[PDB]
Amino acid sequence: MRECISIHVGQAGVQIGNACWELYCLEHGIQPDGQMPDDSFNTFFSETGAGKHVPRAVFVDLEPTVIDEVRTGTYRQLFHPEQLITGKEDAANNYARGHYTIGKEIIDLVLDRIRKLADQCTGLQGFLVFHSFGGGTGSGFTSLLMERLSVDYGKKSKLEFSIYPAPQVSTAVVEPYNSILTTHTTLEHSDCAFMVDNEAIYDICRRNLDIERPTYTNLNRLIGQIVSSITASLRFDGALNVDLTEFQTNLVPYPRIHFPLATYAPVISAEKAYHEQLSVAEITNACFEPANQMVKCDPRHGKYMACCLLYRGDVVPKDVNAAIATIKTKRTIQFVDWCPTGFKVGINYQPPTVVPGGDLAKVQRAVCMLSNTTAIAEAWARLDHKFDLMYAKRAFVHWYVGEGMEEGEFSEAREDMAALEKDYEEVGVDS
Amino acid sequence: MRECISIHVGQAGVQIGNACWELYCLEHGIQPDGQMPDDSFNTFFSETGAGKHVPRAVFVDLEPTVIDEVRTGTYRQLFHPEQLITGKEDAANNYARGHYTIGKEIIDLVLDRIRKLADQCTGLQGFLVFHSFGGGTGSGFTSLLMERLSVDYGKKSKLEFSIYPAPQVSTAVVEPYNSILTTHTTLEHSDCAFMVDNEAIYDICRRNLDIERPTYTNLNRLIGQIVSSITASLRFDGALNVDLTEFQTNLVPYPRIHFPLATYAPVISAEKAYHEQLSVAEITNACFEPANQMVKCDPRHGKYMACCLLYRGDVVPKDVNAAIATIKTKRTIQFVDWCPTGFKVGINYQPPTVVPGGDLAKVQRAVCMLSNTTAIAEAWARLDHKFDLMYAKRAFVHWYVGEGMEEGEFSEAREDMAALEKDYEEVGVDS
Amino acid sequence: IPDEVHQNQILRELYLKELRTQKLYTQYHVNPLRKIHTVTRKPMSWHDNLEEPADARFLNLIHHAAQGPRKKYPETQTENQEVGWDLEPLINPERHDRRLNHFRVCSDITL
Amino acid sequence: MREIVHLQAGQCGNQIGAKFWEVISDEHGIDPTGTYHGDSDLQLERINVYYNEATGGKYVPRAVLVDLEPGTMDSVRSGPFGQIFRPDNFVFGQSGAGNNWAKGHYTEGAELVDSVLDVVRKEAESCDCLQGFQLTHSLGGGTGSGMGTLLISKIREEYPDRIMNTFSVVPSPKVSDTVVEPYNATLSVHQLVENTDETYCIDNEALYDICFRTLKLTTPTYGDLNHLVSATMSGVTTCLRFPGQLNADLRKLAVNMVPFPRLHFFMPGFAPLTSRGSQQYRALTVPELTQQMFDAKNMMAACDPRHGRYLTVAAVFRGRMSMKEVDEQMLNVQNKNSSYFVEWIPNNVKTAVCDIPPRGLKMSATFIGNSTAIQELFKRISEQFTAMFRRKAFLHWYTGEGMDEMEFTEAESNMNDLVSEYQQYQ
Amino acid sequence: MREIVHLQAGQCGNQIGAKFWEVISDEHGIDPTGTYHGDSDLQLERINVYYNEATGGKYVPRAVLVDLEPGTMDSVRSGPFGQIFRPDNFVFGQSGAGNNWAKGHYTEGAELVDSVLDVVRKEAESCDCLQGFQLTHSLGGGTGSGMGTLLISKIREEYPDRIMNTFSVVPSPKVSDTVVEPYNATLSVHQLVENTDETYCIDNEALYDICFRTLKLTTPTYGDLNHLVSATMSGVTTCLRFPGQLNADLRKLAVNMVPFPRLHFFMPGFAPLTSRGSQQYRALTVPELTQQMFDAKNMMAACDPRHGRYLTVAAVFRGRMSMKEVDEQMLNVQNKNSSYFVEWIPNNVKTAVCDIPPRGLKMSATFIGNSTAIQELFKRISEQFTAMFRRKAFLHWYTGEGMDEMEFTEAESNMNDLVSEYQQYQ
Numbered sequence A, B: 001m002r003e004c005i006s007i008h009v010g011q012a013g014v015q016i017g018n019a020c021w022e023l024y025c026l027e028h029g030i031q032p033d034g035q036m037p038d039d040s041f042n043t044f045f046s047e048t049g050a051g052k053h054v055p056r057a058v059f060v061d062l063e064p065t066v067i068d069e070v071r072t073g074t075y076r077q078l079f080h081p082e083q084l085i086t087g088k089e090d091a092a093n094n095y096a097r098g099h100y101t102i103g104k105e106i107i108d109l110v111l112d113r114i115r116k117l118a119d120q121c122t123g124l125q126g127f128l129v130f131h132s133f134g135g136g137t138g139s140g141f142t143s144l145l146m147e148r149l150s151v152d153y154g155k156k157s158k159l160e161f162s163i164y165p166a167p168q169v170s171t172a173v174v175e176p177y178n179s180i181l182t183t184h185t186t187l188e189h190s191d192c193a194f195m196v197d198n199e200a201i202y203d204i205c206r207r208n209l210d211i212e213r214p215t216y217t218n219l220n221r222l223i224g225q226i227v228s229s230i231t232a233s234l235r236f237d238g239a240l241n242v243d244l245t246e247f248q249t250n251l252v253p254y255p256r257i258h259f260p261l262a263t264y265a266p267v268i269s270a271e272k273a274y275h276e277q278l279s280v281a282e283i284t285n286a287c288f289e290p291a292n293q294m295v296k297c298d299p300r301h302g303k304y305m306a307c308c309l310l311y312r313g314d315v316v317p318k319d320v321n322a323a324i325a326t327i328k329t330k331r332t333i334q335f336v337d338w339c340p341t342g343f344k345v346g347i348n349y350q351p352p353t354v355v356p357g358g359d360l361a362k363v364q365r366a367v368c369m370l371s372n373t374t375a376i377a378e379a380w381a382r383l384d385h386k387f388d389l390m391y392a393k394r395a396f397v398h399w400y401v402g403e404g405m406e407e408g409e410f411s412e413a414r415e416d417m418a419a420l421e422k423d424y425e426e427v428g429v430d431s
Numbered sequence C: 001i002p003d004e005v006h007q008n009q010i011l012r013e014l015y016l017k018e019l020r021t022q023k024l025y026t027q028y029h030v031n032p033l034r035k036i037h038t039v040t041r042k043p044m045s046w047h048d049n050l051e052e053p054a055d056a057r058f059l060n061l062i063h064h065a066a067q068g069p070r071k072k073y074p075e076t077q078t079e080n081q082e083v084g085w086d087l088e089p090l091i092n093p094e095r096h097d098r099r100l101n102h103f104r105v106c107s108d109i110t111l
Numbered sequence D, E: 001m002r003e004i005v006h007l008q009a010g011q012c013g014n015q016i017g018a019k020f021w022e023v024i025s026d027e028h029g030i031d032p033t034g035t036y037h038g039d040s041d042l043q044l045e046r047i048n049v050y051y052n053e054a055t056g057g058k059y060v061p062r063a064v065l066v067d068l069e070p071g072t073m074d075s076v077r078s079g080p081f082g083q084i085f086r087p088d089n090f091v092f093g094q095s096g097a098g099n100n101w102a103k104g105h106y107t108e109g110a111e112l113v114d115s116v117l118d119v120v121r122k123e124a125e126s127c128d129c130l131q132g133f134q135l136t137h138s139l140g141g142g143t144g145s146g147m148g149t150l151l152i153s154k155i156r157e158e159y160p161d162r163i164m165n166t167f168s169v170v171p172s173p174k175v176s177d178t179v180v181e182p183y184n185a186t187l188s189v190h191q192l193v194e195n196t197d198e199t200y201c202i203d204n205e206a207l208y209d210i211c212f213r214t215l216k217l218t219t220p221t222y223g224d225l226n227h228l229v230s231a232t233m234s235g236v237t238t239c240l241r242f243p244g245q246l247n248a249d250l251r252k253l254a255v256n257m258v259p260f261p262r263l264h265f266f267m268p269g270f271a272p273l274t275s276r277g278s279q280q281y282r283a284l285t286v287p288e289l290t291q292q293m294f295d296a297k298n299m300m301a302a303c304d305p306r307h308g309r310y311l312t313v314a315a316v317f318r319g320r321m322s323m324k325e326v327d328e329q330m331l332n333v334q335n336k337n338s339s340y341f342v343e344w345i346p347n348n349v350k351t352a353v354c355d356i357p358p359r360g361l362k363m364s365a366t367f368i369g370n371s372t373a374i375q376e377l378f379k380r381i382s383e384q385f386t387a388m389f390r391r392k393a394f395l396h397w398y399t400g401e402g403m404d405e406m407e408f409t410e411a412e413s414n415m416n417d418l419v420s421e422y423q424q425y426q
């Protein structure tokens, strides 16, 4: 009955998506041809008369070199070929080109396949979109993707899983230019929106998973485990079951603030799993470490508004509420005085499943915390400084302006970003 | 005892009728020689006492090269050798030549065979006339063919299947001249007039059948499945059964408006049909898709008058009424205020039969849709412009004038056609 | 104002040295294994439906092209094919056991 | 069923038709003895369009060869395929015309057209239902222009409602041969305005440019030039002899390309031609075949089609192909070339595809185009006639045979009216 | 899918492509006859970027070889890899420019532009969607730099929004092989500053420096030099033909590198190059590849960015490589070198990675980086141009052909303004 639609936008969306959909098939025991050798698969797969399953995913891309690798590999028989949407020409790291020039040629094809998938749904819990701030139409076409979804669909959930531009490492020069102009869309047309930046995931894989040389496949296996633990309360029985709309309402203090931080615990190797036990209290303390956080910001600087936790495995409610008491006793961590009861707890019996060839090991007890802090103002004023530092001498403006957008729209992104950072300042003051 | 006679006039009626009769022969399990290796075949065949089956078809043309391929082809033993009536000299895309000076030699031969075929019938249901508006023989000779059938048979139903001249692509120069004079006959001597043009078949075969360059053979096999779906009610039983008189009363509100639009669903290739789940409540949406319309006109600009739906295969009557309720709740689909009961349902038990070498897929559920809309007003006004643009200073008129028809008949066809387009404007308005 | 009596012999010697330097294609009929188009034959015109043989080499090329990367290559060639390369289960899939494998089960009232 | 009597006139016409009967007997697999040795039996389905059955399974062509010098036919009879013609149809005089239009029309024409019309009466009466006639000639010689125009005039008053087809080689300035060349072409166009249903215009400049630059031939012998013309004649009438999905015979193209009765001059071209070395560097596709059909280098008339407006275009295709590709290509060339094509006739193009191409080739192209650039040929011919007639050049040869001097004034008044009709509709 | 059409200009223009079409043919496994000998099916997946398809399984390059001296193309045609090109692509004149820019721009340019734009319409219209065009030339001769500036100006005007990649070989004071080469360089960069999207500055001093000091070749004939130039030309646009974990095609490098439209001059350099004896003591790891890459020894320009400021940096990598190492090594060089990098643009570097390495090699990279050291080459060229123009040197072989004398001062006003912009951004 319950079901969602995945919208993998961009080259990062495809590499994330095939990491997620590889994990889903082995989780539900479905072969690459789609036929198995119970309604757990109903949330993402669609049943036909012949015994197959079609994933409810739409791949949004503007370059054919990233779709044809999907159509050639092992999963060529899995996905329906009309779900993979390829543009004729890439915007090539341009928000403006994917907003006014390139994106309106295939905006009709995306909304048509959205209509077909939502027609098959008997009741639609929400949408998941996957994209990155850095790229052109991963940030650009996503901006006009939300405009059509919000107007057509009123109160349907639309989750925005994003990748923030890292403060130090980058693969572009116009990367801060693309990120700030997407603040207009996400502030207005997003029910929820996560972010993890790549520099933080770089620190964890070096020291926790014991990998000298990882690529984006080992990062996207980690991000697949985050989404799997989120949606498994929809797919499997739980001692406490938490739906998609449940923790959506319970983490946001204001409609202007819908930006949690995601962390996962434990992340250890199969040789280090031979040594250390993994209990409920041991994995609870690991989510509060600023080293193991998956965003380069320190909650020790800021203040927690609310907390959402997602437990999986041999998890007893006795040990959950015992470890919460220990965390409130330590004075290194703080909570705002206007949220005394800030936690939310969910438990599922099924342990997380592992992928063959992956880096992690199979674990009984795991937790995926969703905490909203005032430490996100640390990673915004840094990017607002660098967006102001480049734009002081008026650089790269001729490429964006000449494509159709006026020069005053850059100044519009200044005040909306300046006002949004002011709304996070008034949260942290105590009454 | 319910029997019909098919008449293929001109070249365009031959290959359209060629796609039909190779489809009909395999639908009834008959060998190419015409002898079977059940009274269903009596609608379209006559059983000779020796054991051979003869089609109820008269192939008439003025050029011998298009019929001589039939006399030596695969089913050269199927037809009677005298039914393949062949003229001496072609009309050369002249409505004047095929109506007055060339068609007067062959009209005596064809009415004797219609009389001899209809004398064999113990009960008659209707005629099936296949042609196109563009060519001279399919236009001029069909004009005086139905004039003689009107004075011989009083209240006999005559289905008129015609290929409409496409707005953009055209294989003739004098093509708009033929269609304006042709409508004068069809306006008075025809009970229905099914309109399908070539250009929309080109686009539907591209994105749905995934064949980039279709020829006439792939075009007419789509036409054959529409005609086979209409006649499947007569030949085969069903939960709901319709006749030729059934939808003639139910789709023609006024004597001047008998031009329905015919589309088919699904049109899915064998590679994709392995993937999708096909149900009754979702193939009704494929009928009302503006891209899947078989005529190059926008149904969203016009208002519907009536719709006739013919489902085939594993169809349950709860599913058609759930699908109609889904369609009527939408706002893009519009209906006139003087017709709330705008639908009609037909369900048959036998699924459509695919042809070896065909492009379609073996599907249980298929639907044929016949609507009479106000969206065909724009499809004639675009051809009303082209004829009057030719007739500004008498282009190509001297070939028709020297034949034997007078100059004032071109204006009389324009005056009748301009009066007919004003009928759509006065009935399309709400009260 | 050109001199055509010289232009013609310039073209003649040009074509002649092109004839001297021309080397023909050595008859290695290579075709892409991806896609090639067809034209549908006539229903009644029996000049199209003659009995005629079909190549088996290109059939083998189709049956080798429509295949998985693991079946094609012994070792992986690029990095994007690394996901899903090993699809085998390390433990047998005892999905029938409701004891250790909790799953959602349909009820008769909802259906 | 539908038959055409082929007719050849003059030295230029006889050499054109000798190659024509050599190239289309290859299509039907007829040996020079006249028997049948072929591979596909479709070649006897439609062979009576151009041939007459003889006893013993021998086929003879339906051609009449008229000339005034026996020095041309004995070369034709000593040719490769010279043994198939009937010796009765060889009609000739003994005294030459001398490249004078008045000789072949008034002096020596009246003694021979009694015999020639007797021969063509027997060939036309032996048909089942006559489609029309075919004539190959040139507008620069005494026999090709003088007797040819009178011979059509006698035909039309006997057979009023037929399809009269003529091929003419138009005189050219850069390949000017005779000193009285504008005299012959001006007096012959006067008759071709009111006496023929369609005329094909061929220039000798375009045949030289095509055979040297595009074909890259070392030796442009007249056989190779005539091999270019013969591919046009075979491709125009291929819908009579060869079945296809969409067909267009002579009368279907007669109505469509003639909007007004004084405009029946066309520009042919052929499009699968390739150079000596670019055989393997080419892709045989319909978009490749369409652009070379429209290419101004491949026009068989020595005038720029870019300098005028197309009235109507007919493209006759061959080989196995799919015509969704046909209609998309012809809309592309109409849409992107808005200025060249006329606006008073949308969809100027007409197409026709036949299943069987010429042997040794997968696909073939036949172009027939009606343009307003034809006035450039007629204006240049008219001024050379005007320069001669002002000083009365070479008139004593023509006026001494019984032809009045006012007939040239009537001819140029008739011809200059035709040039204004081209500009009137342009 | 996305297409770059190749163009040539001059004797240096033809010799660059003669080695460039050889090196990528072996990359795509194409023999001199033109067959396919490949072990990976992924090569043929994206091959339509540079090859057109012909019948029988033939691939022909999309190159137009332009020259005014046919002796150069005859050496190209008689070369090992010269028969692959279609013969219509060779466009030649009959009289040379004589190393004069004005001769190749005004006098003989107008009679040869009609031929080359007649060809490039066929190389553009015959496909689905164009990504851009490519030009290679030298700024020392009047052939390549002459109409090579002027062929762009019409085709930029015809095609307004495309991508125009150019390879320019600037003249040098040490390898000065032409007296009039400052007159050639100054009036070409003047046209190049407004007509061109991208331009790479390669100089023969640095080509000599790399082959002598680093590669230790004893007899480096220009084929070996053109091997090094064409390896950079392949590595820049290798994302068009090969998918990667992170891809960046020509348009991706187009927007991000140029901060302003008037500064599109870059310096290429390459890393894996070593000497014949130093291979077995050298490894290939990402640090080794980036350590040698920003080294000034392997730069292919006659400028040193140690005296200047890196505006924007790029690096396009190839081979089996981890994302972190490509990111951690490039972070250190930005942080440690606080003087060579600009301060008003942080994270100056763009990065791309390609899975498919060049054959016979495991790892590789291609460098593009815009610096204010390019004004060293611009100032020393301009001062020699002003020195000779002060004393009326060689002018009547330009102004005697019908051109104004004041166009130089407008070009001088453009030349010193461009170097003024590089100073105020430094």
Ligand SMILES: Nc1nc2c(ncn2[C@@H]2O[C@H](COP(=O)(O)OP(=O)(O)OP(=O)(O)O)[C@@H](O)[C@H]2O)c(=O)[nH]1
Pocket (backbone or CB within 6 Å): A009, A010, A011, A012, A015, A016, A062, A063, A090, A091, A092, A093, A094, A132, A133, A134, A135, A136, A137, A138, A139, A163, A165, A170, A171, A172, A175, A197, A198, A216, A219, A220, E246, E247
């Ligand atoms: N976390 C994470 N980020 C990625 C991954 N792949 C790409 N990115 C981010 O994506 C940004 C660049 O965008 P692209 O990968 O080119 O894809 P895109 O967003 O569609 O941009 P275009 O290709 O120009 O359309 C980089 O700044 C990266 O930060 C990935 O696998 N994981």
Ligand SMILES: Nc1nc2c(ncn2[C@@H]2O[C@H](COP(=O)(O)OP(=O)(O)OP(=O)(O)O)[C@@H](O)[C@H]2O)c(=O)[nH]1
Pocket (backbone or CB within 6 Å): B009, B010, B011, B012, B013, B015, B016, B062, B090, B091, B092, B093, B094, B132, B134, B135, B136, B137, B138, B139, B163, B170, B171, B172, B197, B198, B216, B217, B219, B220, D246, D247, D252
């Ligand atoms: N949809 C469709 N249209 C066809 C087909 N065959 C012919 N036509 C149409 O028929 C029109 C011309 O008429 P023809 O079929 O060629 O022959 P005709 O009607 O007898 O006219 P004449 O040949 O002059 O006697 C063309 O413009 C085509 O659009 C077909 O198989 N399918």
Ligand SMILES: Nc1nc2c(ncn2[C@@H]2O[C@H](COP(=O)(O)OP(=O)(O)O)[C@@H](O)[C@H]2O)c(=O)[nH]1
Pocket (backbone or CB within 6 Å): D009, D010, D011, D012, D013, D015, D016, D099, D138, D140, D141, D142, D143, D144, D145, D169, D175, D176, D177, D178, D204, D222, D225, D226
């Ligand atoms: N196409 C073509 N033209 C020819 C041939 N032979 C001669 N001509 C042309 O015919 C013209 C002379 O015509 P002529 O032979 O005197 O005509 P006649 O009086 O009927 O014999 C010359 O200008 C030639 O260009 C030929 O074999 N083919």
Ligand SMILES: Nc1nc2c(ncn2[C@@H]2O[C@H](COP(=O)(O)OP(=O)(O)O)[C@@H](O)[C@H]2O)c(=O)[nH]1
Pocket (backbone or CB within 6 Å): E009, E010, E011, E012, E013, E015, E099, E138, E140, E141, E142, E143, E144, E145, E169, E171, E175, E176, E177, E178, E203, E204, E207, E222, E225, E226
């Ligand atoms: N990098 C490089 N430069 C060359 C090469 N050949 C010639 N040049 C340069 O080109 C200049 C002369 O080129 P030139 O032959 O006159 O060019 P053209 O006039 O266009 O044919 C000299 O200054 C050389 O520096 C080469 O193979 N590589």
Ligand SMILES: [Mg+2]
Pocket (backbone or CB within 6 Å): A009, A010, A011, A060, A061, A062, A063, A135, A136, A137, A138
């Ligand atoms: Mg994208």
Ligand SMILES: [Mg+2]
Pocket (backbone or CB within 6 Å): B010, B011, B012, B063, B135, D247
């Ligand atoms: Mg016909």
